[PDB]
Design a protein that fits this description.
Length: about 350
């Protein structure tokens, strides 16, 4: 078929599975969240917590689906239908190495639901405690062993793909052990080889040798807020792509519809990026496509704390907070606008 509605398997949407309800999980997990103290605000702060009541949740926006559980198979069905509407073929699942049965259950449910809609799943490896290249290898082996034969497990030209958040927390000399073909604990040429996509943060003078010396297969930028880092400044994307092509690396720029995290980080208002009825998202997505990249990542499906979500949001005013909403746009606007951009991306590919 050539309908302009099919999923794109070079489009990765960052997905969070940490939401809970009292009924399913025992607590409205993540809807309730600690408020971060101001890192520049001195001692004795007692910032408090957002309780995750119906009236007061840990987001500046409010989900159409309410205070949902990421373990609810019925929510997962709805999310997969939202991915189909957005044309986003790959769900990039946050992974925190919780080593708990409720994690394991959730991952299986997500894979199952994704497969019903021909969506694929890859893992976004977060900065879990004592993360290092040895336990990363062990975890990559575990994930490929547990999930690699699931029909929804993502591969690109035969290889799994992992995004590695805050990959700069690990020295290139350690990464080389895992990612060079000659490395002491290499995954190259093994059953556990994968495309490893590191987080490009700062200036080229630092990041170019880091990526090369660490032997990453590519890089992404994550942040939805333009200008937060060099990497998340879209005017740099043409030159980042040129370098990537010259050095055999895969650049997967991250685009998002806005940013606001001031319910949980009230001191972080300088990072706010206004959605302007979709114009911010359009500008950022256009820059990614114009850079001539092979793959794009979306920050985010549902990082509600950071206000980067494309998941449907609804107007809501409670006695405790007046939420932001999609303003002049309908709740599913960011899903259908994603589909528009996926089409433009495919037209350019
Ligand atoms: O997925 C990468 C990165 C994206 N921003 C945050 O989701 C971050 O997690 C940390 O912040 C959230 C609140 O925004 C918090 O709930 C988590 O426990 C982390 O501290 C992700 O690593």
């Amino acid at each position: 078929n050539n309908l302009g509605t099919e999923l794109d398997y070079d489009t990765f949407c960052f997905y969070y599975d940490w939401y809970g309800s009292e009924a399913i999980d025992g607590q409205y997990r993540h809807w309730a969240h600690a408020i971060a103290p101001d890192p520049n605000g001195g001692s004795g702060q007692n910032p408090g917590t957002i309780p995750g009541t119906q009236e007061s949740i840990a987001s500046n926006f409010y989900p159409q689906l309410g205070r949902y559980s990421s373990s609810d198979p019925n929510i997962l069905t709805k999310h997969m239908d939202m991915f189909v509407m957005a044309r986003t073929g790959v769900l990039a699942l946050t992974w925190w190495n919780e080593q708990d049965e409720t994690e394991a259950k959730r991952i299986g449910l997500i894979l199952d639901a994704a497969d019903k809609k021909k969506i694929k799943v890859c893992f976004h490896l977060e900065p879990y405690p004592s993360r290092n290249v040895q336990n990363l290898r062990e975890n990559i082996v575990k994930l490929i062993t547990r999930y690699g034969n699931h029909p929804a497990f993502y591969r690109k030209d035969g290889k799994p793909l992992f995004f590695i958040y805050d990959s700069y927390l690990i020295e290139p000399s350690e990464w080389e052990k895992l990612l060079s073909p000659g490395g002491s604990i290499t995954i190259r040429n093994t059953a556990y080889d994968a495309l490893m996509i590191g987080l490009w943060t700062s200036s080229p003078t630092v990041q170019r040798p880091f990526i090369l010396n660490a032997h990453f297969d590519g890089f992404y930028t994550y942040f939805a807020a333009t200008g937060f880092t060099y990497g998340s400044t879209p005017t740099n994307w043409v030159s980042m792509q040129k370098w990537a092509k010259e050095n055999g690396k895969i650049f997967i720029p991250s685009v998002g519809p806005g940013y606001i995290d001031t319910r949980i980080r009230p001191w972080n208002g300088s990072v706010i990026r206004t959605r302007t009825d979709g114009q911010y998202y359009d500008a950022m997505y256009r820059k990614a496509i114009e850079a001539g990249v092979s793959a794009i990542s979306i920050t985010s499906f549902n990082e509600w704390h950071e206000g980067s979500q494309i998941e449907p949001a609804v107007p809501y005013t409670s006695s405790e907070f007046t939420y932001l909403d999609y303003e002049n746009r309908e709740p599913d606007y960011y899903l259908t606008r994603t589909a528009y951009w996926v089409g433009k991306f495919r037209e350019s590919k």
